[PDB]
Amino acid sequence: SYAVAGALQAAVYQQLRADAVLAALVGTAVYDAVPPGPLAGTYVSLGPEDVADASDKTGAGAVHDFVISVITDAAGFATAKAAAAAVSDALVGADLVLSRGRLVGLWFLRAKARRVEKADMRRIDLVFRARVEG
Amino acid sequence: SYAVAGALQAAVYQQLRADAVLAALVGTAVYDAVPPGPLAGTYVSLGPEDVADASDKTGAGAVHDFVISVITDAAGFATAKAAAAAVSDALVGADLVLSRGRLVGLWFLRAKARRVEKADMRRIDLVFRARVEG
Amino acid sequence: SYAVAGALQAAVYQQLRADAVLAALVGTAVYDAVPPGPLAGTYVSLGPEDVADASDKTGAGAVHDFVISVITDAAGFATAKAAAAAVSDALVGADLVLSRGRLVGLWFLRAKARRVEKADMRRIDLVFRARVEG
Amino acid sequence: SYAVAGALQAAVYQQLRADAVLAALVGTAVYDAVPPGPLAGTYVSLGPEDVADASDKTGAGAVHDFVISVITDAAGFATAKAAAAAVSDALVGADLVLSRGRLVGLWFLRAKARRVEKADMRRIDLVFRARVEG
Amino acid sequence: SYAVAGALQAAVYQQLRADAVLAALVGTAVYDAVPPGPLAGTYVSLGPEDVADASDKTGAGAVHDFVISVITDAAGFATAKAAAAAVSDALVGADLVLSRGRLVGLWFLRAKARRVEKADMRRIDLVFRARVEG
Amino acid sequence: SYAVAGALQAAVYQQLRADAVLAALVGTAVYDAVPPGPLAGTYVSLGPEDVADASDKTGAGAVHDFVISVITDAAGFATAKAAAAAVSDALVGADLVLSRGRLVGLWFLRAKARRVEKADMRRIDLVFRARVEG
Amino acid sequence: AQNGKDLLIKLDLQFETIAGLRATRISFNAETVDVTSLESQGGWRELLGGAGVRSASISGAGVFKDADTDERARQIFFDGEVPEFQVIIPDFGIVQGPFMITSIDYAGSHNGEASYELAMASAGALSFTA
Amino acid sequence: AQNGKDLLIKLDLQFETIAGLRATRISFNAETVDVTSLESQGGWRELLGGAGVRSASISGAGVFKDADTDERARQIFFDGEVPEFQVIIPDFGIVQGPFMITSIDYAGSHNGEASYELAMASAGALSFTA
Amino acid sequence: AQNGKDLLIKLDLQFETIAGLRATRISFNAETVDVTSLESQGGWRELLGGAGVRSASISGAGVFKDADTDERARQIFFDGEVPEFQVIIPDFGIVQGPFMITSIDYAGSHNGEASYELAMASAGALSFTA
Amino acid sequence: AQNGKDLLIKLDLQFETIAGLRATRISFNAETVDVTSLESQGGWRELLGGAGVRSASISGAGVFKDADTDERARQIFFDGEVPEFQVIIPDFGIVQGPFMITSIDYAGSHNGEASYELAMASAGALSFTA
Amino acid sequence: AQNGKDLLIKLDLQFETIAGLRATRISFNAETVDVTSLESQGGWRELLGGAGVRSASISGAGVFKDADTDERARQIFFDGEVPEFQVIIPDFGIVQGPFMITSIDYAGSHNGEASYELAMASAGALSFTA
Amino acid sequence: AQNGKDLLIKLDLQFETIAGLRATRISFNAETVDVTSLESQGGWRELLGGAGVRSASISGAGVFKDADTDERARQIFFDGEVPEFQVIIPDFGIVQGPFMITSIDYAGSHNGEASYELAMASAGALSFTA
Structure with a gap:
């Protein structure tokens, strides 16, 4: 998107699947591309960001408002909350390492939670603001 | 959603199904996941919140605007009002106990009321603001 | 919706079907639940409110923006105007009696008027602001 | 809608079909309810108002933003302009007589013009502001 | 729409099909009503205005925001740009002659450009502000 | 769109397909019109601008907010990021040469990134602000 | 709570309401x-x-x-x-x-109503009827 | 109520309306x-x-x-x-x-009308025709 | 954090809350x-x-x-x-x-509530109960 | 009415328009x-x-x-x-x-144009060409 | 660039952050x-x-x-x-x-948080740790 | 017209741009x-x-x-x-x-950047390089 967005999704994927919680609560089912197979059904997904172009005369940066959705096949979605709670416990104030530039603050934004389809699957989006500096 | 959202829906479900009114007006039909069977038809439902990220330098919190819908198969929906009146009598200024952090004020917000489908079923949403502190 | 909404729709239904005009202009066809039969076709309907939560530290109230629609099978909808004129003559500055709390002012708001379907039926919504005090 | 709306559509229908222009440009095809037959095809239509409730402590009034559409089966819609020009020449600053109250100013508002369906028929809405006093 | 709109579309059609550029770039394919035949496929179209009612106590005028679309069957739409560039070169600061009143300034507004259907045809709208004085 | 838009898309197409990166990351698959064949599947597309008419008394200009989308058939869209990163590395502060007038600043704007269809293809729009001077 | 329509300012001629009073406000200092x-x-x-x-x-x-x-x-x-x-x-x-x-101050536009503000201030000793 | 178009300010040359008067306001003090x-x-x-x-x-x-x-x-x-x-x-x-x-003050933009405010104040004794 | 409803200003008659207090604000200087x-x-x-x-x-x-x-x-x-x-x-x-x-200052409109601001200032020595 | 583009302020060097004049306003006092x-x-x-x-x-x-x-x-x-x-x-x-x-005053941002206001005031006797 | 969370104002009791600091601003003059x-x-x-x-x-x-x-x-x-x-x-x-x-100044509403501004000014000679 | 990025204010240490300059404005008086x-x-x-x-x-x-x-x-x-x-x-x-x-003045919030305004004024005789 902006130049940092190649490295940002890579590093927030690496801070995920390293937290001990959400590894005993989701498992290995944290991905962007879905591994085809049986579709385990309590995964998360980390793809849709958008940029709010916060830049400079000398240099330029980006505000990545990336969405991490939590999808859960369970009957209620109290299961999907603690998995999303372990997302938000892992990412606000992250201070991680990027491959192009660095980020300065990984804050938290709106996080809606609803039934996507036939009321069988439950999507909890989690928008995180990622002010990165190129 | 935010870290408190695992405990918030759990505690507002426990303050429901303990009020004496709405137990003689709905019954045991307060849930998130629907118990399959005959579908009694005068239930409520407590799932869709969203967060408005009110946080701090030192610590962080959340504004959960959770929706409690009231669904009713009766011909008119004066039956659905008093069940929703017993929702709102049970929740504004609740001062309940959470498992992760605590809430500081459970206020009241917009509460629309309409016919969802074929004008046979009537949905009364009730948005409550839940400023919780992690 | 809010606690007064059980009594508000009940009392505005009772001030309707007591006005002499709209009793010679609609008849007994003022309802929420439709009486099944032949569908007379020049009815009104009083169900969809929504609340704008005007409350207090000490006590709480509500702003019910309830919609009273006027439906008419006549070819033109000059017939539907005077029935809606007799709605608005009956309700602005009503000062009626409620069963839970009281209202302080039943004002008037937007009132759109259009063809709902196939241009055979004509819907005149009439939004009235009902600031009630619990 | 408001109490004046029974008399307002009646009087703006009577100022129409009395202008000499639009009587030689449309004919007798000014109506709300369509006379069934062959559908002449260069008519106008005067039904959909909405109210913006401009009222008082002592007395009450209304802002009727009524829409007069111009429909035309001609290939181009330069024919529909002069018919709509004869609408607007007939109504801005009208100072007509009502049966319930009076109006104080019949101004002019937005007037969009587009193809409704299959690009065969052309709709020119003409919104007129009618501040009436009950 | 307003009274000038009968003469405005007539005069902006006459300033088109008189520019030397867009006559060697479109041809005779500038119209409102489509001449039926083979549909040449690199036409423009001048019909949908809307009015923003800029008027007076003494006299009245209009702000016609008319849309001139450019449609092109070519594979890319660099062909459609120069035809739209020859539209905008012909109309901003036009100072033309009307039949009802006159215009005072024919400015330029937003001009979006996209694929309408199946990504085979490309529509370049060009909104021009026409402050006319009746 | 505006007069410069014939030359603007031509010059931003020429600065693309000349960068060394995105030539080893996309290839020759940078176009507006799609070359029919096998549809390689990791292309970009540069067509939909819109104008925000920033002009003058003496002279006139345009704000072209052109969209360059990145489409990718890969399973994840980390591949589509670095191709879009090589777009944004090629265009912000471009200072290129136009055929009609010149541009003064080619800045960066919002850049959303999502799954278009069946979640098989991934679209990364990249809106760039192009303040050109005619 | 009280109705907004009930609180009314009024002139003498015996006191009557001034016709259009969309917004009114008593203010003590x-x-x-x-x-x-x-x-x-x-x-x-x-x-x-x-x-x-x-x-x-x-x-x-x-x-x-x-x-x-x-x-x-x-x-x-x-x-x-x-x-x-x-x-x-x-x-x-x-x-x-x-x-x-x-x-x-009376004010009117090319499309709006004729409107007015009416601003007043105390000139003597007040009262209160309870 | 009254029409906004009816209340009009006017100059002498015998009094005529000044051509464009979108908004006008008499204000007493x-x-x-x-x-x-x-x-x-x-x-x-x-x-x-x-x-x-x-x-x-x-x-x-x-x-x-x-x-x-x-x-x-x-x-x-x-x-x-x-x-x-x-x-x-x-x-x-x-x-x-x-x-x-x-x-x-006359004002005009690159895309708008030529517009003006015209601000006046009393210089002598007034009247009222009733 | 604290509830907004809990912080309350109150008059004597023994202190009771003034009925409608949608917004309140103590301010030191x-x-x-x-x-x-x-x-x-x-x-x-x-x-x-x-x-x-x-x-x-x-x-x-x-x-x-x-x-x-x-x-x-x-x-x-x-x-x-x-x-x-x-x-x-x-x-x-x-x-x-x-x-x-x-x-x-009490204020009311043609469609709103009767509302009021109540502005106060210190007139003597304060306290703090801890 | 008149075009907004036609009313133009201009400097001497023989008078020419200053290049960018999006908004201009003569104001008398x-x-x-x-x-x-x-x-x-x-x-x-x-x-x-x-x-x-x-x-x-x-x-x-x-x-x-x-x-x-x-x-x-x-x-x-x-x-x-x-x-x-x-x-x-x-x-x-x-x-x-x-x-x-x-x-x-000249002003510019990280993404906008270079822009300016140019504020002037009378320094002598004026004229009017009619 | 720097994190907004990192710049923090703090009181003595040895210095600790004041609990809620949504917005802070040092300003020199x-x-x-x-x-x-x-x-x-x-x-x-x-x-x-x-x-x-x-x-x-x-x-x-x-x-x-x-x-x-x-x-x-x-x-x-x-x-x-x-x-x-x-x-x-x-x-x-x-x-x-x-x-x-x-x-x-502490402030709270009927539905919001209890909030405060805390405005300070210099009373002596400053420093800078580099 | 000119790029907004090209007009830049700069300090001495030989002059370099101050790092973050989202908005800048020279203003003469x-x-x-x-x-x-x-x-x-x-x-x-x-x-x-x-x-x-x-x-x-x-x-x-x-x-x-x-x-x-x-x-x-x-x-x-x-x-x-x-x-x-x-x-x-x-x-x-x-x-x-x-x-x-x-x-x-340096300013930062709980979710925004660390930001600053930097306001300056003339202290001596200026120049112009043309």
């Missing part, structure tokens, strides 16, 4: 005469209280509708008077003080 | 000469009322359309005069006072 | 008496600190609901007093100072 | 010297009119485009002068007065 | 003592520079959360002191100056 | 010394022009990014100096005047 001394327990500001003068001001706006009492507000301003005015709180009751007509 | 004394029933502010001076001000804006009377407003400002002006309330009637031309 | 001298390490502004007076001001607004204590705020203003007022911070505790009733 | 006396028919404010001084001020803003005359506005400000300026009303005609260059 | 003389190269304004005094002011707002150090800000205001305060720029480092507690 | 006399052709305001002093002021804001020259702006303010500053118009060229550092 005091200037807080400061009596600070060297010796203070925490250095907190010391105020005498009762000695300082006190005010009331009325600002009623809305649509210009001609009535017999709307023409009275023209008459009060041109021939300079201080007549009796009366703003009634819905529960509290009437006020019944002599005010003056400090600034009025 | 008084300065409330305070006459407070030691002995007051509640300490309420005491005002004399009638002795204080009184004002009127006109602010009429809209599109710059050249007329014979719009050129007159140029003539009143450059050659400093205090001619007769007349703002007519729709029901009340005309005013007919000598005003002056305190500040006018 | 100091005037920063400047004691700047020739010799300063960086030329930084020098302030004595403690000697300067200090203030408190309360601004509580909301819906006009008639209570026994809302009528008290009428009584405090007309008969000029400096009674005891009390704003309680949710954790901090009560304040319990003598304030006065500097400006109150 | 007078200070209304008050001559109030004891004896007044209604107590209405009395103004002499013509004796009071009178002003003009020009505020022209837009995109910074370098021209030969935009560099002139730099030259007028640094070497302090009062040259002749000329704002032409579309119907009225030109003004042709000596103004000065009281405040100019 | 100087009054620019003017030393203009007859002889100037272009007539440009002449300023001495260093002699003029210089200031710092801190404005930190957010949610009222009770902590041991939030109660300290109550203690600094009632018992008038000038203690040491410390705002740390994320890269620059800490400031460590004596400030005072010029105005604080 | 004059006070218009009035020389009005009895005899005037139309009574138009008379101004001497050149004698009055003249100013320049720079206001550059954006994200706080630590650089070697951003730390210089800390050094200019604490140790009071009037060093050379340089704002370059994209076509016009550089300015190169001695300014001072009148007010700077």
Whole structure:
């Protein structure tokens, strides 16, 4: 998107699947591309960001408002909350390492939670603001 | 959603199904996941919140605007009002106990009321603001 | 919706079907639940409110923006105007009696008027602001 | 809608079909309810108002933003302009007589013009502001 | 729409099909009503205005925001740009002659450009502000 | 769109397909019109601008907010990021040469990134602000 | 709570409502005469209280509708008077003080109503009916 | 209520409307000469009322359309005069006072109309036709 | 954090909440008496600190609901007093100072509630209950 | 009505338009010297009119485009002068007065244009070409 | 660039963060003592520079959360002191100056949080840790 | 027209850009010394022009990014100096005047960047490179 967005999704994927919680609560089912197979059904997904172009005369940066959705096949979605709670416990104030530039603050934004389809699957989006500096 | 959202829906479900009114007006039909069977038809439902990220330098919190819908198969929906009146009598200024952090004020917000489908079923949403502190 | 909404729709239904005009202009066809039969076709309907939560530290109230629609099978909808004129003559500055709390002012708001379907039926919504005090 | 709306559509229908222009440009095809037959095809239509409730402590009034559409089966819609020009020449600053109250100013508002369906028929809405006093 | 709109579309059609550029770039394919035949496929179209009612106590005028679309069957739409560039070169600061009143300034507004259907045809709208004085 | 838009898309197409990166990351698959064949599947597309008419008394200009989308058939869209990163590395502060007038600043704007269809293809729009001077 | 329609300002001719009163507002004031001394327990500001003068001001706006009492507000301003005015709180009751007509202004646009603000201020001793 | 189009301000040349008057506003004023004394029933502010001076001000804006009377407003400002002006309330009637031309300003943008404000203030004794 | 409903301002009659308090705000102040001298390490502004007076001001607004204590705020203003007022911070505790009733204003519209602001300021020495 | 593009302010070098003039505004002023006396028919404010001084001020803003005359506005400000300026009303005609260059300001952002306001005021006697 | 969370203002009890600090702002000031003389190269304004005094002011707002150090800000205001305060720029480092507690204000609504502004100003010589 | 990125303000250490400059604005000023006399052709305001002093002021804001020259702006303010500053118009060229550092302010929120305004004013004679 902006130049940092190649490295940002890579590093927030690496801070995920390293937290001990959400590894005993989701498992290995944290991905962007879905591994085809049986579709385990309590995964998360980390793809849709958008940029709010916060830049400079000398240099330029980006505000990545990336969405991490939590999808859960369970009957209620109290299961999907603690998995999303372990997302938000892992990412606000992250201070991680990027491959192009660095980020300065990984804050938290709106996080809606609803039934996507036939009321069988439950999507909890989690928008995180990622002010990165190129 | 935010870290408190695992405990918030759990505690507002426990303050429901303990009020004496709405137990003689709905019954045991307060849930998130629907118990399959005959579908009694005068239930409520407590799932869709969203967060408005009110946080701090030192610590962080959340504004959960959770929706409690009231669904009713009766011909008119004066039956659905008093069940929703017993929702709102049970929740504004609740001062309940959470498992992760605590809430500081459970206020009241917009509460629309309409016919969802074929004008046979009537949905009364009730948005409550839940400023919780992690 | 809010606690007064059980009594508000009940009392505005009772001030309707007591006005002499709209009793010679609609008849007994003022309802929420439709009486099944032949569908007379020049009815009104009083169900969809929504609340704008005007409350207090000490006590709480509500702003019910309830919609009273006027439906008419006549070819033109000059017939539907005077029935809606007799709605608005009956309700602005009503000062009626409620069963839970009281209202302080039943004002008037937007009132759109259009063809709902196939241009055979004509819907005149009439939004009235009902600031009630619990 | 408001109490004046029974008399307002009646009087703006009577100022129409009395202008000499639009009587030689449309004919007798000014109506709300369509006379069934062959559908002449260069008519106008005067039904959909909405109210913006401009009222008082002592007395009450209304802002009727009524829409007069111009429909035309001609290939181009330069024919529909002069018919709509004869609408607007007939109504801005009208100072007509009502049966319930009076109006104080019949101004002019937005007037969009587009193809409704299959690009065969052309709709020119003409919104007129009618501040009436009950 | 307003009274000038009968003469405005007539005069902006006459300033088109008189520019030397867009006559060697479109041809005779500038119209409102489509001449039926083979549909040449690199036409423009001048019909949908809307009015923003800029008027007076003494006299009245209009702000016609008319849309001139450019449609092109070519594979890319660099062909459609120069035809739209020859539209905008012909109309901003036009100072033309009307039949009802006159215009005072024919400015330029937003001009979006996209694929309408199946990504085979490309529509370049060009909104021009026409402050006319009746 | 505006007069410069014939030359603007031509010059931003020429600065693309000349960068060394995105030539080893996309290839020759940078176009507006799609070359029919096998549809390689990791292309970009540069067509939909819109104008925000920033002009003058003496002279006139345009704000072209052109969209360059990145489409990718890969399973994840980390591949589509670095191709879009090589777009944004090629265009912000471009200072290129136009055929009609010149541009003064080619800045960066919002850049959303999502799954278009069946979640098989991934679209990364990249809106760039192009303040050109005619 | 009370209805907004019930609290009404009114002129004499015997008091009648001025026709268009979309928005009205009684506003009381005091200037807080400061009596600070060297010796203070925490250095907190010391105020005498009762000695300082006190005010009331009325600002009623809305649509210009001609009535017999709307023409009275023209008459009060041109021939300079201080007549009796009366703003009634819905529960509290009437006020019944002599005010003056400090600034009025009629305004109208090319498409709106004829409207007016009517701004008043206290000119004498007030009252309260309870 | 009254039409917004009916209340109109107008210059002399015999009075004609200035061409573009999208928004106009007559505004009256008084300065409330305070006459407070030691002995007051509640300490309420005491005002004399009638002795204080009184004002009127006109602010009429809209599109710059050249007329014979719009050129007159140029003539009143450059050659400093205090001619007769007349703002007519729709029901009340005309005013007919000598005003002056305190500040006018013509404004135009790259895409808008040529517009103007025309701000006036009272320069003499007013009237009212009833 | 604390509930917004818990911090409440209250009048005497023994203290009760004033009925409608949608928005309230205690506000403390100091005037920063400047004691700047020739010799300063960086030329930084020098302030004595403690000697300067200090203030408190309360601004509580909301819906006009008639209570026994809302009528008290009428009584405090007309008969000029400096009674005891009390704003309680949710954790901090009560304040319990003598304030006065500097400006109150009741307002109502043609469709809204009857509403009021109630603006207060310190008139004596304050306290803190901890 | 008139085009917004036609009314243009212009510098000398023989007068040319300053390149970017998105928004411009001539504004005339007078200070209304008050001559109030004891004896007044209604107590209405009395103004002499013509004796009071009178002003003009020009505020022209837009995109910074370098021209030969935009560099002139730099030259007028640094070497302090009062040259002749000329704002032409579309119907009225030109003004042709000596103004000065009281405040100019160039501004630019990280994504916007280079822009400027150019604020002027009258420095001598004006004219009108009719 | 730096994180917004890293720059923090803090009180003494040894310094701790005040609990809720949603928005904070250190602000430095100087009054620019003017030393203009007859002889100037272009007539440009002449300023001495260093002699003029210089200031710092801190404005930190957010949610009222009770902590041991939030109660300290109550203690600094009632018992008038000038203690040491410390705002740390994320890269620059800490400031460590004596400030005072010029105005604080707690505010809460019927549905919002309990919130506060905390406005401070310099009371002595500052520092910089680099 | 010119790029917004090209016009840049810069400090000395040899001049470098201050790191984050999202918005910047050079602003020139004059006070218009009035020389009005009895005899005037139309009574138009008379101004001497050149004698009055003249100013320049720079206001550059954006994200706080630590650089070697951003730390210089800390050094200019604490140790009071009037060093050379340089704002370059994209076509016009550089300015190169001695300014001072009148007010700077660092600000940060709980979710935003660390940001700053940097407000400057002229302290000596300016220049222009053309």
